[PDB]
Structures are given as C-alpha cells and as structure tokens.
Amino acid sequence: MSRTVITEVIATADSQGRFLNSTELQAAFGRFERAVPAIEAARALTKNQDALVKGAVQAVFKKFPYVTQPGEKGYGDSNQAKCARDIGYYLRFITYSLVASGTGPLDDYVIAGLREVNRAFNLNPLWYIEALNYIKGETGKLLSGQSKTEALLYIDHAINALS
Amino acid sequence: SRTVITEVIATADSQGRFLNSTELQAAFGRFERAVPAIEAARALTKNQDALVKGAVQAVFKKFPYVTQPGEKGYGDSNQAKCARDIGYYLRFITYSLVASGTGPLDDYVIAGLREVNRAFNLNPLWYIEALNYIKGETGKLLSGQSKTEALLYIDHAINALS
Amino acid sequence: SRTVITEVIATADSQGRFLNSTELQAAFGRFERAVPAIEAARALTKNQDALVKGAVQAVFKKFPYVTQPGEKGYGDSNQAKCARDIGYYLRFITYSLVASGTGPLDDYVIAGLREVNRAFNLNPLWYIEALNYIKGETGKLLSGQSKTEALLYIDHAINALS
Amino acid sequence: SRTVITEVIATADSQGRFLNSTELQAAFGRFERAVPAIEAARALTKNQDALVKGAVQAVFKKFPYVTQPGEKGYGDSNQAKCARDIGYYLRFITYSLVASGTGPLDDYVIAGLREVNRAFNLNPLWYIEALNYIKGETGKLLSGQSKTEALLYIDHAINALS
Amino acid sequence: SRTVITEVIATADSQGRFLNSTELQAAFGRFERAVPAIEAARALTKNQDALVKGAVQAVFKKFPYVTQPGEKGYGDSNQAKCARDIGYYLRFITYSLVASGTGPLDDYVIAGLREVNRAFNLNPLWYIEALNYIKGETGKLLSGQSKTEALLYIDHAINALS
Amino acid sequence: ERIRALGTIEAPRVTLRAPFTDEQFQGALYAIYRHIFGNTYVMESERPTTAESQLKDGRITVRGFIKLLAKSEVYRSRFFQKTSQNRFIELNHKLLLGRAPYDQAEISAHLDLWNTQGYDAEIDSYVESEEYLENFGEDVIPYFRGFKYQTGQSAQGFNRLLDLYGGWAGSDTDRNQSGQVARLTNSLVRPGQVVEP
Amino acid sequence: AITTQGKRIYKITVSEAGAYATNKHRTGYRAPIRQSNYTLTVPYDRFLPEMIRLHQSGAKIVNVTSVIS
Amino acid sequence: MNDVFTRAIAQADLKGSFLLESDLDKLASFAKEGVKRLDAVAALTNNAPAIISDAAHKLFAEQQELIQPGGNAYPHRRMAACLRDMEIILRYVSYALLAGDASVLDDRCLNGLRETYNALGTPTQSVARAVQLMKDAAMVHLKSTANVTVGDCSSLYSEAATYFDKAAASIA
Amino acid sequence: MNDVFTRAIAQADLKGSFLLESDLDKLASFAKEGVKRLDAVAALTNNAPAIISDAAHKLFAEQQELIQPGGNAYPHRRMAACLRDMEIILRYVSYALLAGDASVLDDRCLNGLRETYNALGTPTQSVARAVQLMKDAAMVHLKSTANVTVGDCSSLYSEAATYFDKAAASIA
Amino acid sequence: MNDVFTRAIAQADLKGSFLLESDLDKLASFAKEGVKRLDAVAALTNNAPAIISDAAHKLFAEQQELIQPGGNAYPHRRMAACLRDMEIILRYVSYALLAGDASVLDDRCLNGLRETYNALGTPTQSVARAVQLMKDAAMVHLKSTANVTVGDCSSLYSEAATYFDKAAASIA
C-alpha cells in the first residue's frame, strides 16, 4: 500500500469513485518518462555499494569522534558492524525509492516509526544525517544529469525525515 | 492548568453533577500533601543558583564536546541560555510542587517540547543529565515525603524529555 | 465500577499514559481515608437489623396512610418488601463506604431508580425519609471522622432520590 | 406546536420534497374529523367551572390526607392552586381538541412534566385521578365521536402522567 | 413500502413512542378512503389491455421517428417491451391505489429510474406521453373521487419522470 | 430481509436545524441516543442534561452534541474501558461513521493516534474528519450507511458491517457473558483466508 | 479544556461564498442545504484544525472573537 | 478554569520569578484551611435540592407574574428550564467555592449567559433575584454546625457571598 | 495495493537484498512500454458506458430470467444496482491495468463479493457471466487502432483478459 | 473494570449479604499496606523506559531472527509497534498493580490479544518472552531501596510477578 505516482492517482480516483481522467494519465506518463534516469541512478548506486557504505561509516566515526572510544555506542565490534548494516539499509531504501520513483519505500520502511525506535534505542539522528550527507556528496560524483538531482532529492527527503 | 483540584472540577463537570464523596476525598488527599510540597518548594527555591550552576557544569563534564568551539555549547550567550533553561526547569518544578500537580510543568515545558527541541536542535540528553544532577542533590537537600515529591516531579520531567 | 482508584486508572488510561504523580496522590488520599470508612461499614453492618426496623417504623410514622388497607403498605408481604428495600439501601451504602466511592450506589440503586419507582408507583419520599432516619441514627452510632463519611453517603443517596 | 398539518409539513420539508398524496390525504382526514373536535371543545368550555370543581372534589375524596394541615393540600391558597392546575389541564385538553393534534398538550403540560412535578413534590396520581373524574363527567356531556376524541386526549394526558 | 400506515408506524418507531391520536386520525382517513381507491384499482385492472395498447399507440403517434426502422422503437421485440413497460407502470399505479400511498411506485419504478433510463437511452418523454394518455382515458373511465386519487398517482409518476 | 437490516435501511434520516420547535428535538434526542450508544439501554440518570440544553439553545450543532456524547462517560464506560483497542476502533467506526473499518491501516493509525494523543483526540479524528462532514454534516444524526455501497469502500466493508450489526434488536452492550470482545480481529488483517491453529 | 491552554474559546462567523458552492455542486448535496451565513464555536485546543478545515471547504470567514477574555 | 494555586503561579510566571515566601505562606494557609472549605462545598452539594426548592418557592411567591400565562416561566417547559438553570448556577458556584477562584464561574458559565436571556426575552433581574435567594438558602445551610466540628469560617461565608452576588451582577 | 514496481521492491526486501540487474531491466522495460498501458487504460475509461451497455444488453438477452418479474434485476432499483456493479468492476480492472499488478483488483474490489452476493442473494454465476461479457465488449475497444498510433499490444490484451478472468473466477 | 474492593463487593452482592468481617479485615489491611503499593507503582512508572529498553535489548540480542529482513520486527514500523506493545503491556501491568486486581489487564489488553497476534502472524512465544524480560527488568527496579524507607515488600513482588505471568501466559 506504498506511495507512488501510480498509487496516488489510483487512490485519488478510487476515493472519489471515478475513473482515471486525463490528469492521472498525465501524471502516469510523467512517471514513465521519469523511470529511465531513476532506474539507471538506482543501478549506479547499487553497483557502488561497498565504497558508499564504508565511506559513510567512516564519516560517522570521523565527524563524531567521541562515539569511537569506549563508553559510547560506537565501541564494540558488533556496534560498528551493525552501523554498516544500518547504512546499508538506508542506501537500499534510497535505491528502492529511486526505482519506485516515489517516497513510498522510504516512508513505509524507514521513516514511519523512525523517531520512536531512535529514542528507545538511544540512537542520535545526527549520525545518520551526516552519513546521508556523505552519501549525498558521493552521489554528486557518481551520478550526473537529472539522475543526480533525483538521487539528491530522495536523500534530501530522508535527511529531512531524520531531522 | 491541570491540578488535582482542577481535574476534580473537570471530572465532576463532564457529568454535569455536584462533587460527590470521591471528588472531596481526592481534594483532601491533595491538601494532606500540600504542606510537604510547600516545604520542598521552599527548600529547593532557596538553592536555585547553586543548583543551576552545578547542573550546567554537570552537563559540561558529562558532555565534554559541548564546550569547545564548533558547536552549540561554546559561547557566553549560549551558556547564559543554558543557565536560563535550567532556571526555567527548576522554576516550573517549583510551580508543580506548589500546585501539587504536573499542570504547570506539562503545559509550559512538556507541551511542544519535542518540536521545540528539534527545531532549535537542542539535544534533550543535556536536560536529562541536568535533571539527574538535580535529582542527586535533592536526594540530600530534602528528606522524607518532600524528598519523594521532588524526586517524582523531576523524574516526570525527565520522562517527558525522554 | 467508579471509585477513587478506578477513576484514577480510567482517567490515566483514556489519555493513554502511565500513572503520574497526581493519580498517586489521590490514591494515597483514598488509601489513608479507607480506615474510617471501614469501621463505619463495621458499625452499620453490626446494627443492620435495628437500623432497618427503625427506618420501617419511621416510614410508617411519617406516612400514616400507607399502612391503611387498600394501599401499598397494607399486607405483610408489602411490609416485608419495605424491610427488604431498606436493607438493600443500607447494604449498598456500606458497600460504597468500603469502596471509598459512590460506585456501588450509582450501579445497583441510582442507575434506573426513577423508571422503576414510577412503574410500581413507589414514592421516592418514602425512602428519602427512611434514609433520613438512618442518617439520624448514625448520628449516635458513629462519631468523629467516620461519621462524616457515612453521612456523606447517606445524603448522596437521599439527593439521588430527590 | 404540532398538529396533523404541522406533522405533514415538517416531514415533507425534512424529506426535501413536495406534497404528494399521502400527507394531503392525511390532511383530508384531519379536516374531515375537525368537526367533532369543535363541538367537543365547545361543550368542554361550556362546562369549565363544574368540571374543575368536581375534579378537585374527587381528588380530595381520593386523597383525604392531602387536605390535612401540614400536608401539600392544606390551606386555601393550595386549593386555589388545585383549581388553577385543573383549569390549566382542561384548557390544554380543549386546545388539543381544537388543533385535533396532541401537540398543544405536549408542549404545554408534558414538556418537562417530570422535572416540575418532582421539584415541587406534586404528585402525578392526584392529576391522574382528577383526569379520571373528568373522564367520568365528560361521559355524559358529549355524544358520538366527540366522546372518543375527548377520551383519547384525556388518555394521552394520563399516560403522560403515569 | 411507504403507505399511510407504514409511514405512521415508522415515524412513531423512530421517535420510540406509541401511536397517539394524530397517527390514528391519519389511519382512519386512509381506511375511510380505501373504498374509492380500490374502486379505481378495479376499474384500471378491468380496462388493462385497452389502456396499455392505447398508451403504446399514443406514444407512437407523438413520436413517429421512433417507429422508423433501425431505431430504438422499431422491432416486434421493442413493441412487446414497450407494452411490458406500460403494463408495469399501470400495475404499479393500481398498487399505489390499493396501498393508498406512493409506496410501490417509489419502491419499484422511481427508485433508480433516472440512471437506468440514462444507461439504456430510453427517453422519459415516451413514458410521460404514455402516462398522459392513461390520465386522459382514466378521466373517461373513472368518475368522482376515484378519478382524483388515480390522477394524483399518475401525476406523481409523471413528475418523477419529468 | 435476507440480511437482518431491513428496517434500518427503511428508517428515515433525521435532521435538526436551528428553529426546531419541540418534538423534532425530542425525536432527535431519541434517535441520537439509540444510534450513538449502540442500541444500549441508557438510564435517565446517565442522560446528559447540560449537553441537551446547549443543543436546544443552539450553541452546539448536532455534530458537536455527538462529539460530546462520544466523549461522555457512558460512551467510555461501555465501549472503551471494557474492550480492547480493536473493538473500540470498530465501535467508533460503526457508531460515529456508520460504516465498518475497511482495512488494517485504519486500526494501526487510530491505535497509534490514541496512544500518542489521548481519547479526546481519538474521538475528534472521527467527528472532525471530512467523511463525517460529507455524509452527515453538522445537522444530520448519523445512520448506518454501510449497507448501501459507499464511494470508495472495500469489498469487505459490507460483510464487516453485517458482522457488527447483529439485528435491529441486538446491541453493543458490554453486559454480555463474553464481555464485549472484538469481532473483526482476523477479518481485517486476513480478509479472505481462514486458518485453524 | 482542563488546562490553561484549553480555555479561552473562540467564536467564528462563517460565510459560504461561491468558492464553497462551486465545489459542493461537483461533490453533491447529500447533506441537505442550509443558510449561507452561520456562526461556529471553537476552543483553542482545535482552533487551528477547524480553521484549516473551513478554508479547505471553501468558505470565507468574517471575524473571530475571543469569548473568554 | 483556574484555582488560586494556579492563579498565583500565573502571576509568578508573569513576573518570571519564583513564588515569593509570603506567597507560599498564603498558599499554605489556604491549604491548611482547606478542610473547612471541603465542609463548605459538601454542605453546598448535599443540600442543593432543598436550596433550589426553597429559592423557587420564594421567588415565584414574590413575583406572581412569572407563573401566570404570558409569564416567562409559565409552561412546564420553561419552568423546568428555570429550575435546571438555577441548579446549574448553584453547581458552578460550588465549583468556584471549592476551587477558591472565581475563574471557574466567570470564564465559562457566564460568558453569553447574560445575553442569552435577553435573546430569549428572559427578565434578567428575576435571574438576579433567584441567585440572591439561592445565596440566602446556601448561607442558611452553611451556618449549620450539626455533624461538623465547630469553628470559625467567616472567610468562607464572605467568599461564598461574593461568589453568589458576583454571579448575580454578571447576570444583573 | 501495489503496482509492479512496489511488488518487485517488496520481494527484494523480503529477500533482504538490493534489486538485481534482471529486475531492474524488467522494470525499465515496463516503464518504456508503459505508454501503451496508458493507451489501454484510456481506451477502457473513454468507453466505459458503451462497455456496460453492451454487456448488460447481451446478459439480459442471454438471461431474460433476471429482468423478468420476480427475478433479481427486476424491481427497477436492483437493475441500477447491477449497472453500478458493472461500473465498479470495470473501474477496478482499469485500475489494475494501469498499475500493472492485480493487487487493487483482488484487494479493494473482490475479496468479499462472493459472500456479499451470497448474502444479498444475487446469483454469482450470472455476475461472472456479466464480467466476462464486459471482457469481450472491452477487447473490441482495446484493440481499436482508430486515432491511435499503430503498434503491437498483445501483452496488454493478455493482461486485460487475465484481470477480467480473475474477477470472474473470484466472483463466480 | 474492578479493584479488589469492588471484587469483594460484587461477590458479596452475588451472595446477597453484607461484607463479612474477614473480608473487611482483608480490605482494611490492603488499604493500610497500600503505600508500599504506591511506591511499587511509582517505581514501575518512573523507570518504564529503562525496563522497556533493557527488555528490547535482551530480546533482540537473544532472538535475532526478528530484526532480520523478512523478520517480524524488521522495519521501523514493526519495531515501533513492538516497543509500543511492550509499553502498553507494562502500563496495564502497573495499572493492575495499583488496583490490586488484574481485571483491567485481562479486560483491556488481553481479551483479544492472542487472536490479534496470531492473525498478524506475530510469534506469540517471542511476545511472552518479551513480557518475561520486562518482568525481570522491572523486578530489578522494584527491589531497589534508594529514595524510599526500607521495608518488606515480598508480597508486592509476588503480585507483580503474577501480573506479568498473567500477561505472558494469556498471550502465548
């Protein structure tokens, strides 16, 4: 029941109990011409997995040096391993949102209930915000054209959600 | 605001009927806890300055990174804001003690706390640390029931922050 | 039903939150108030039969005609029903004393009292003045604190009738 | 108030639609039966004083204890109020006859009857058997369908009382 | 359905009350007038085939293009289906005469009439002319008040179509 | 008639505009108390006289009166305090909106909204919604509108309302020997399938 | 309303100028029509969402008055 | 709505300083005398129907015009409205008494209550007279010392008189 | 509900892995050929009343038993209900056509129509017959190369046929 | 919704008799030693985030399969629902502890919880394990003696354990 241009138009038509007029078809055509840059951006972002996730982890460590040493969340091998896992999750859902060409996957799979989990596990949103900032900086170099704009659009949506 | 008395009035009002025995018993239970509350209010009002400065220092020691430049804590005006924030929390805890209800605390600090803290990027854990400090020395400044009432109100403020 | 503890829990639950201070203070007030209510219940329970007989005779005094043949009061069955009704009111007053709330009254008597009084033509003033008799009789049975509670419940039932 | 025409028009406006056959048809019934109403009301207005005096006398015979000093019906002003109340009921019954709808009776007597009869400790049964005497005396005054119209309206008043 | 009796019962039920005198007056008028309406129903049922065939012919006369080949009216099946539709309408007019209210008409014909006519390209004007012809002929068939009731129901159906 | 709810559909819609005289008001009160409280018996002691006075004066519309009744102690003590949250959501839908819940998303959203903002916000989400104002508006007493096809409804909504209805006589007491348990716990999250443990 | 914020209720006078009727013609009057001008009451607890709802509907308001102080 | 505790906190937060020592002394004194206030409000609650009945008797016996046809409290509907309004006024007065603050009465029960009667054509001076009679009966029932330990509560009587006469003036 | 993209995303998430090259290629192909899908949905929406009219005509000629008095679609209201049901089912098939996944169809539209029609007493078999009549009457409009660029759309014809058949088989 | 007093009252009413002497003594003793109950309830309320966080940590370290992709607490939405369920259950356990009776628990949080969890597919065994972990983490807090007067509260510990066990055994 995710959110997508196709889903938006279907839901608006259904709620009003009518067919899809010319406006919904305009929107769907726009999405279908979206989907070539979106999918190739998702492909470029998927092919470049390990560099992105490792760089984001090390950005979390460098920008937040006090997390590194004992007595904090960042100490303990499993902690940074599972940090890498978390950044992998975030990158994966960015790719899902590029493929869907909507914020449906991000919202449903990360953003919904994000704050409660962050609170009840004592995780600072700032770590993830600046990690996404690093990933944004890298996609400023892996991608070009309107693909860069759309990948940055979804990363900005995720950052705004974290903030 | 929401006090014991005001909640009694509201709950007797919603049914549109006179205060029966239960409302009066709740009011009496408020009153029999009024004088330890006033004792606590006096005892932690006479120690406002030491408590606020110590809470600010405790935040600094527990959070060294909020001292040096490159962040919020660095700055004379920022630290004046720190002290003023701690004074605000302490004053509202006094108000809640006097009212014997979380009313002033709720509707002043708690109402809109998360949005305010995010939009100005003030980490709540700063204030949990300061309130834990205040917990620590209200453990000794107050004894008996007033100690318990303090502990309870500061804890409720903490849980609102967390 | 509806007591101090139950009202506290229901209020803290409708709002969907843990029990904060004010709820606990009301609970404490009720818990400490429970003692006088308990010996008041002891006193009324011990003097059950004398109180019922006195209330019935007060009824037959203030309303002399009711005992005449051809009306509600005539017939041993109707006298027995009067005694049973007085026992019911007295028992639920002791119940509400023990619960330290007006719950049992508002459930087993007050809820639907007017409809059933009207259907059987029962005069509310009958039970009003019988409860007045019991009210006077606990003037001597109970003294000091518990007398206030017992009087409060007796008069709440009277107010419900009228 | 609410007559047959009123009910017709109210329902039609509620449905947002014109006057179809059903309610014009009921209006025809109302106009047709409007005559027995007029002579019934004229006979009732002819016999105001006799009806009210007989009614209060029948009440006093039915409820002799009411006249005793220290009771509701003691005194001259109270008996004047008896006559006035019975006159009010008679006037509203004739009004309901003329309107050929229960409406006036409802919105003048029944509307909030229980609250008033409870606040002033007026007894419904007094008026019930007063209206029974009115039945008995109208059994001879009217003939034909005027009798059944008057009796249906008095029955409406009584059912409202009881 | 929506008769006089059924509308009475439904409006009393919605208000949760018995039937007081006004609804019984409406029912009495309905029962008094049942005789003319049943007379009209039996006259329409007697002259059934003639009315149907005349209505179809009148529709054709006022709508000549409808008889043109390759068009909606042309075809033995569509002639038969015209006859069936007018038979349905006349049947339901007799039904409403018997039920002394536009119950069956609203239930069967009018409910959903507009969108089903739209979804079949059936001009309402055809049935309007058929009902106008039936009105004209029942002017001949029926004399007095049966005429009035019939004409009320045909005119109601005409209004629903128009 | 094969469905139980023959008489409910035939039941007239009730409206209360500002210059209502007497019996329009008296009928409106009975209709409101019969529908909102789920055909449960409401004793004369529990009837809120002050809300009725406000309605009679016209300070609050019929919708505001409905909102106050939903926040009253009768509504709580019957539907909220004695039932799980699923049953509370279903009862809120059936009474305040006239329709059964359409999917599990409604339960999730309403349970989160209650847990985060309280019973008053939970109820306001129903009455203040655009759906209530569309179907009923200020001056129309709510009615069971799920028996007809409602624009945008799910295929299962009609069946769920059938499960909730239980006849013109039956009511949502909480005085049952069962204790007012939920009816649609498995129908909402697993609509089509049936399972045996 | 139990708290200080809850009180200080507000009164709003609402007009139903054409920007509302043009939408409701397309939606349909499945709620029977009323007069155009009407006055609504609102507490502070729901003052914003009510105003948002009224502006979404398409009505134009005249004034808002603080009943309490 | 407010009580004197929240009222004092309101001024204290307006200045922004903590509650002063004398302020705490006043509030502690108010709380200590609280049980006498609870007895006052219990006497007001318990005997409310008697107050209403006596006030109605006296008010209508004083002004025969209201009862008579054409009078504003003539039919059963309007008489019941009179009685219901009187008990609502007494209920809100008792609310204010227990709260020790007039805000409960002033800010919600008396906003349009004065102008509503004028809209209905109700004689507001009759409402004021009813309020004063309610005050007299309330004082009669408050002065009673049966079932309660004796003491001095002239402050309570004066405050209740202010509450009643201020409600009347808000109507007057 | 899902479109094809969301379904592929959900499966990739359950496997806990990124979207493969193969899945990306299938979705890219779907996007490139989505224009013809838009044309097919436009064909369904522009000719809805015609499709319903043909289906109803052929159904009630095939089954005089329904329109015949005492039958189901007789009382001139149940007939409008039948036409509305045709409307709803065609609408949901058009939604499932635009989406590319039958999720809207079997979720919003036809979970309970089996038991809904059993409760209301309507013959589900005639409903399925009506749905496949809608299928036949819709294919002629879907294939219509009038005023539309000529191409190949066999996959879309198959998809629409499968959705109509799914609806018929579920309701049947 | 009941407490121990209303349970005794209702049972007496079913019998039809006044409350027996022994029952009065039990209720009076419950009230007398109820300040320990207030302390325990305040301990549960005050430390609730600590109990919930510790239980979540031990559960998800112990049961890894939940937080895995395709696991039942995998996305943030399911994790938030997990933590919210833990919080609600702890809230109603504290409610029952203050009331001295498990009626509110079995009446609001457990009359339809096993069926709900099964219909959602959630592992009820893991939910019961979570409830036991909250039980342990909450006993660690109740047995704390800081800030309070030392005393004996073994009966309160046993009662809170029985409430947690009631939840855990009526969920699993």
Ligand SMILES: CCC1=C(C)/C(=C/C2=NC(=C\c3[nH]c(/C=C4/NC(=O)[C@H](C)[C@H]4CC)c(C)c3CCC(=O)O)/C(CCC(=O)O)=C2C)NC1=O
């Ligand atoms: C599908 C979306 C989703 C995400 C993204 C997600 C993240 C997530 N963060 C968690 C807590 C955690 N998160 C972290 C991350 C930290 N590690 C450090 O190196 C960094 C400074 C920092 C990351 C930038 C850590 C260490 C925990 C452990 C807290 C605990 O043990 O409970 C956990 C609990 C797992 C456990 O306790 O072992 C999860 C599942 N969960 C989800 O459902």
Ligand SMILES: CCC1=C(C)/C(=C/C2=NC(=C\c3[nH]c(/C=C4\NC(=O)[C@H](C)[C@H]4CC)c(C)c3CCC(=O)O)/C(CCC(=O)O)=C2C)NC1=O
């Ligand atoms: C009466 C209720 C009330 C509260 C509770 C309150 C807190 C508060 N403190 C503020 C200023 C501030 N306060 C701080 C202090 C924080 N940063 C660090 O130094 C410390 C660790 C920590 C203090 C414990 C800072 C840095 C600001 C500047 C705002 C910003 O950085 O964005 C602000 C932003 C506006 C301003 O006051 O200038 C708020 C809302 N304000 C209120 O009106």
Ligand SMILES: CCC1=C(C)/C(=C/C2=NC(=C\c3[nH]c(/C=C4\NC(=O)[C@H](C)[C@H]4CC)c(C)c3CCC(=O)O)/C(CCC(=O)O)=C2C)NC1=O
């Ligand atoms: C809408 C038309 C209307 C009715 C029906 C009506 C009945 C009525 N009768 C009243 C007084 C009374 N009426 C009676 C008469 C009763 N007691 C006995 O004498 C008799 C058995 C019996 C009459 C047959 C009495 C004794 C009172 C005085 C009640 C009191 O002051 O306590 C009162 C109170 C008014 C006042 O205090 O002066 C009302 C409202 N009033 C109306 O405006």
Ligand SMILES: CCC1=C(C)/C(=C/C2=NC(=C\c3[nH]c(/C=C4\NC(=O)[C@H](C)[C@H]4CC)c(C)c3CCC(=O)O)/C(CCC(=O)O)=C2C)NC1=O
């Ligand atoms: C319960 C009451 C009821 C009514 C009122 C009713 C009217 C009605 N007439 C119909 C057919 C029709 N009706 C007409 C109209 C008539 N034929 C022409 O000769 C005349 C010009 C004209 C009348 C003056 C036609 C032409 C059709 C055939 C439609 C078609 O198959 O295309 C249909 C469509 C069903 C079918 O295809 O058989 C309905 C619903 N049906 C009902 O069950």
Ligand SMILES: CCC1=C(C)/C(=C/C2=NC(=C\c3[nH]c(/C=C4\NC(=O)[C@H](C)[C@H]4CC)c(C)c3CCC(=O)O)/C(CCC(=O)O)=C2C)NC1=O
């Ligand atoms: C929120 C608190 C509240 C107030 C303040 C209140 C006053 C009030 N009185 C009303 C009617 C009335 N009020 C009265 C009473 C007055 N007229 C007579 O002169 C008496 C001497 C005098 C009694 C003090 C009467 C007779 C009516 C009926 C007016 C009518 O129906 O036209 C009404 C309109 C309908 C109604 O509510 O019953 C209101 C709002 N109601 C409330 O719920």
Ligand SMILES: CCC1=C(C)/C(=C/C2=NC(=C\c3[nH]c(/C=C4\NC(=O)[C@H](C)[C@H]4CC)c(C)c3CCC(=O)O)/C(CCC(=O)O)=C2C)NC1=O
């Ligand atoms: C007020 C009384 C009440 C409660 C508390 C209640 C719980 C409840 N839990 C739910 C789902 C859930 N419940 C859980 C929790 C379980 N799954 C995890 O594996 C853990 C082992 C375990 C928690 C310790 C999870 C993860 C969901 C999400 C499943 C989904 O969203 O589909 C849902 C349905 C969807 C939702 O609310 O979001 C309810 C209603 N229902 C009630 O009527």
Ligand SMILES: CCC1=C(C)/C(=C/C2=NC(=C\c3[nH]c(/C=C4\NC(=O)[C@H](C)[C@H]4CC)c(C)c3CCC(=O)O)/C(CCC(=O)O)=C2C)NC1=O
């Ligand atoms: C459960 C509800 C409740 C009740 C029923 C209640 C009555 C009450 N009145 C008390 C004392 C008192 N009450 C009064 C007031 C009265 N003195 C005169 O009779 C005046 C006429 C009248 C004022 C209206 C006074 C002067 C005292 C003594 C001062 C004191 O003990 O604090 C006390 C404390 C002493 C004792 O009774 O052992 C109680 C409990 N308090 C409550 O919380």
Ligand SMILES: CCC1=C(C)/C(=C/C2=NC(=C\c3[nH]c(/C=C4\NC(=O)[C@H](C)[C@H]4CC)c(C)c3CCC(=O)O)/C(CCC(=O)O)=C2C)NC1=O
């Ligand atoms: C807002 C509404 C809207 C729609 C629906 C739309 C569809 C659309 N159809 C197109 C051409 C086309 N349309 C079709 C589909 C047709 N060819 C087959 O023979 C079938 C008969 C039939 C579909 C069943 C095909 C095959 C093309 C050429 C593209 C290709 O090579 O596949 C194009 C490309 C440029 C053009 O000719 O306009 C668009 C954008 N455009 C819009 O603005």
Ligand SMILES: CCC1=C(C)/C(=C/C2=NC(=C\c3[nH]c(/C=C4\NC(=O)[C@H](C)[C@H]4CC)c(C)c3CCC(=O)O)/C(CCC(=O)O)=C2C)NC1=O
């Ligand atoms: C506002 C809410 C509120 C709280 C918090 C409260 C606590 C409270 N605890 C008390 C004593 C006590 N409190 C406890 C409970 C503690 N001791 C046990 O060892 C455990 C560590 C722990 C409970 C598990 C005990 C055992 C007593 C002494 C009871 C006695 O034997 O008299 C007392 C009576 C006076 C005193 O001795 O201080 C109070 C008022 N009262 C309240 O109205």
